[model samples]
Every structure is written in C-alpha cells, then in structure tokens.
Target: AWEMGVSDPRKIVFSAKIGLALTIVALLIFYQEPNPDLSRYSVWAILTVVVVFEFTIGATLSKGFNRALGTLSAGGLALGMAELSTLFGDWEEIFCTLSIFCIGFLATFMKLYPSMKAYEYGFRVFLLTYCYILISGFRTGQFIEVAISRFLLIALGAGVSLGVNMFIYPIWAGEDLHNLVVKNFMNVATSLEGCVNGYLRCVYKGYRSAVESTSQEESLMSFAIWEPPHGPYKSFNYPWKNYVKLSGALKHCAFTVMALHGCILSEIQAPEERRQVFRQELQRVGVEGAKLLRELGEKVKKMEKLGPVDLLFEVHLAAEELQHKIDKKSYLLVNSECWEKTYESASALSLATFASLLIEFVARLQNVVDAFKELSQKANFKEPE
Candidate 1:
C-alpha cells in the first residue's frame, strides 16, 4: 500500500478508521437501545458522518459546521410552522405546502447570491434541512421530537467526523495554502525563464504548462478561497486576501516577461558592427534576467529569503552600458555627412528601446518578489532574513 501512488497512505488508513468507528458507534446505539424515540435517529448520525467527511480536514470541518447549522435552523422553522398549522386547522395541509414552497424558493435563490458567497454551503443546508424536517414533521405528527432527535444524531456525527479529521493525520489548510503559494511563485519563475530562454517546458497539464501563467494562477487562487486558517491566528483576520493580490502581481510579471521576450525576438536592421553590439547586449540581458528568476524560483520553493537585490542593479548596469554604446554611435551618426545616417539612427533607437524594455522587465520581476514577501508575512511564515 505504501508503494502505491497514494499521496498520503495515512489518508487511506484514516478513512478505514472512520468506517470502523461508524460501525462501532451504530452497533453501540443499536444494542444499548437508548430511548426508543432517539434510537430511531441513530441512522441519521451515521449518515451525518458519511456526508460531512471529506478528503481535506478543512473541507470536512466546513461541511460538518454547515450541516449542523442548517439542521438546527431548519428544525426550528419546522417547529414554528407546525404551531402555525394548528391555527389553520382545516387548512393545515395548505399552510404546510405553502411554507415549503416559499422556503425552497428562498434557499435556491440565496444560494445563487449568498449574503456571504463563501458561506453558500450554509444556505444549501438551510433549504434542504427545512424541507426534510417539514416533511418528517408532517408524517410523524411529532415535530418537536423529530427535530430534537435529528439534531442530536447529526451533532454526534459531526463530533466524530471533526475529531477524526483533527486528530488522525490532520491536514491543515494553512499548510496547503503555503505550498500553493510556493508552487505558484515557482511556476511564474519557470514561465519567465522559458519566455526569456525561448523554450517552454510542458507540465502534464496541457493548459497549465502553456504560456498562460495568468490562467494557472487564477485556478490556484480559486482553490485557496475554500481554505480556512489553520495556524494559531484569528480565523477572520488571517490575510488570505493578500494571496489574491500576489496572484495579480504574478499575472503582471508574466505579461512583462513575455513582452521582454518579444523585444529579444524583434527584428532590427543596422550595419553588421552595430547589429552585433545590439544582439550581444540583448542576449546578456536575457541570460542575466533568466538566471535571477530561476534563483528566485528555487528560493521560494525552499521557503528561503531571496538573495541580495544586487541582480537588479546588474541588469541596470548592463542596460546603461548598452545605452552608452548606442548613444556614442547616435552622436557619431548625427555629426557625419553619411547619407544612411538616418537609418542607422533608427536602428540605434530600436536597440535602445530593447535595452529599456529589459529594465522594465526587471522592475516587473521586483514586483513579483515584493508580492511574495508580503504574502509570506500575511501567512505568518518567516520572511527570509
């Protein structure tokens, strides 16, 4: 089993443990025969465990919490409606049907535009529970009793699921988010390196390995939204939103990196001597930039602070060196009586443009690094010293 491709064998063992625990819990309830009324809902407990358990601990906790709240709210509404039905007497069935219709409509509507979109899961439970309890109440003529039993059983199930998720090979949302951040940064580096080097490597995912770094970042951002804070920090105050901003920075970096590649690949006409100068400088800029990006990529993956910001300075120096060379020629062209001086001047300007664009690409890289720094702090990870 350990040799298999299972990412975490513990997850498989944990799942088996849950199955065994559920059976034990059900059997205990069956044999003990706790009050006949409550025992009837024991199956509800088993069902709760099954429904709430998820692959990720955070997801399990989220679903369990939502189910409990939904069940309680629906139970309360059903009890209230039962009392109201007493007033309707002969029209009881009509009142019950109308209530169900309205609640159902509202549940589906709220799901589409939740008060807090992140809590959409809660709304789903709200509606489903309302309908479930309402029907159960109508059948058994014991609204209060059924509601209590359901809540107790569901609570028991939730407690078991929560306990298993937290204690048995528990997966933390914070950890997942951290790894996700590192992965995204590395991807940006790889993409930039590829663009600058003019060779994109294919990852197994056809779309992700493509040049669309922005699209890949978007998917990672969406996955992070569901993650709850797992560290010793304020749940609501955790800086998850910063991750989104980081993604935006990465997107900008991707665009600028590709633009730099375009500058390198663009055609320019000039005397062979002048063309050699331009080509050599451009290649130097691209190599140095790609080297820096690759280093940043490794540092991010290792959760290390980036090395000195000296590389950007080197890029600046190289760009300036290229500019001085271009400027000297431009001055010579202007002073000479040569007929082709205009075309030569244009070529020099184009090379100058390329050098400037390289500087811009470096600036974009800086933005990506800064964004990563901000995100690390927000995530409560240590910044590289």
Candidate 2:
C-alpha cells in the first residue's frame, strides 16, 4: 500500500474514509476518559515514530499537509452523512440501505476501482451510519453522540491512512517508474525486431501489444503528473511526474525504432545489390548497440565513480546514440532505393540482435535509476535535475 498507493493519493479514498477515524476518536473520548492510554503501548509508539518518519521523508511536507486536509474532509462528510440520517427520522438508514447497493455497483464499474486498494469505503460509510441509527433507536439515546463517533472513526481511518502513508509507510514511486521505462524499452525492441524479420504479421501483433501497453502506462503517469484533485483530496506529486515524462520519451524512442524498421522493409523492392548495403548499415547499428551494452554494464558497476549528474548524462548519451542509429536506418529505407533482400538469414539475425539491444539499453537505464534508488529511493530524478 505504501509503495504504490501512498504516493499516488488518487488511489486513496480520502473523503469517505474520514468517517471511520472521526467515529473512533469520538467513541474513545466520549465513552472513556479524555486521557485514555493510547500511548501506553510501546508498539503504538514505535508505529507512530515510523509513521512520522515515513510521512516526513517520503511525503514532501507539502504532500503530508494535503493528506491532513483530506482527513478533515472525510470526517466532515461522515458527520454530515450521520446528521442527515438522524434529521430525517431514520430516513438516513433507508437512504444508506438503498444507497449501499448503488454505490457498490458504481465502485465496481469505475475503471480504477478494482485496482484501488479499497472499494469498501463507501459501503462501510453506509453501514456505519445505519448502525448508528439502529443503536440510537434501541437506547432511546443520543443519536448525535453515536453518529459523531462513527463519523469520526471514518475520518480517523482516513487520517491514519494518510498519516501512515505520509509519515512512516514504505512508499516509493521511483522503483515503479524505473521498471516502467525498462519494460517499455524492452517491448519496443521486441516489436522492431519482429519487423526486421520481414514477418509483418508478427510485427503488427507485437506492435499492437507494445503500443497499447505503453499507452496504458503513459496515461497512468500522466494522471499523476497533472491531474491531481482540488482541495482536500489526495493527489499524485513528484518523481511520479518524471516517470510520466520518461514514459513519453520511451514512446518516442519506440516510434523511431518502428519507423526505421519500416524503412528497411520498404527497401525490399529496391535492387538486391543496393539492399545489401542498406542491410549492412542496419547490421552495424545492431552490432554497435550490442557492443555498447557490454561496455555499459562495466560502467554501471563503477557508476558510483561518476557523479549522479554525470551518470544521467551518460544514460542520455547512450539513449541518444541508440535512437540515432534507429533514425539512420529509417532515413536509408525511406530515402534510399537500395533494396536489401526481402528476407535473408544475415539480415534476419542482425535485426533480431538489434531489437534485443533495444530492450537491453532501456533495461540498463532502469538499472542506473535503480542503483540510485538503492543508495536512496527518492531523487528529484528527472530531466533538468
């Protein structure tokens, strides 16, 4: 939960959750002494310490502040929901009973609902409000007190969740971001290699999967980067934004790879003799990329010798060079009529190797980022840093 959901607060159900928290707090205070022993246990203290540290370190102070506000909103919603239920002479219970199924159905249908950690928040709110009505009816008692406590617990859960996320949870966005870049790079390379084989059918198959997968990943990153909710709702913030940018760059790189492959495929109609020359160029890029990967591995082992900024520069250089070869291949295919054979053993082998290297390069870049995260899991690790 801390790893992915915490940093990306859209995954957090902030408004509906405050009811749990507020209810818990109010129940504890009203039912027991104000100075009750919440701090009596060492476990609670340790947990609190850890939570605070996580909140301070993982969450930028500002983000933690946002979570705090979210708790308030959740608590407020619970309070209002409880009050509405009571004011209507148990109309609230009826509303909740009916609303539960509708909200439950809607939550299931929401695109991110399944992926979200909890779908029970809304349902639980309904139940808790209903529970207050039942209990208050039995006691001929204070519905407001019971209602307030339930609302507070929901708020408290929201607070605790956000608190735990921001303060002490093991949330890390960098790792996922790094993995995404590596994975996409691998995918594009695989698709391009299929193209080089003159297996147009295979190429399209791979391309479709790669593009769709990358688009999904890119879209998620985009939401994090710019689509944060207003007011007290939790939203995605930095390092995540960088990941989104990386996804875009990888997409561009993939397009370039595909374009080059298409250029070569188009060359099949050209003179076989000239085609051989084109094939040689394509082969050269593949060989060069493979060779670079070998050397790059060694550089990574000693990457610490290079400053962080320098290492990033090296990664960009390698990526730029790799893309350059792709561009060159495309240029030759599009501009040069020199046709290589439509299918040749030598060309096929070279293409396969080239595509493999595409995956290899991006994987290596991820390794570089992972290495930094290993040293420290968070960095302002994007362009212009």
Highest lDDT model number: 1
What are the lDDT figures for the candidates, one per model?
0.63, 0.45
Candidate 2 ranges beyond 4 A from true positions: 1-140, 152-169, 197-210, 213-242, 256-278, 288-385
Q: TM-scores for all candidates?
A: 0.68, 0.37
lDDT of 2 by residue, 1-385 (tens): 6877767774454323334434444454466544534323223323323333322223334444444454455455545565565666846668656644664465346625556443344444444443444335533556566555545544444455555444333334343444555555455555555554453222554445445565456544433343334332244444454445544544544554565556555533333443443443444444444343333333323322324353344445555665565566554333245557444434444444444454454444454344434422343222321
- TM-score result, candidate 2: 0.37
> Which candidate tops TM-score?
1
Q: Write the per-residue lDDT of candidate 1 for residues 1-385, one digit (tens) a residue.
A: 5655286676677678688668766776877745866666778888877777776665665566676687678768877878888897798789888988989888877777644666777887788777876566465657667666777777777787777666766665555555665566566556555554452111222214334444444444444446555445446656656766766676666665556556555665334455454555656666676666666656655656554555477766766776676666565334355557566576656645545666677666777667877766665654566
lDDT for model 2 comes to 0.45
What's the lDDT of the predicted structure labeled candidate 1?
0.63
Q: Candidate 2: minimum summed lDDT over ten consecutive residues — where? A: 48-57
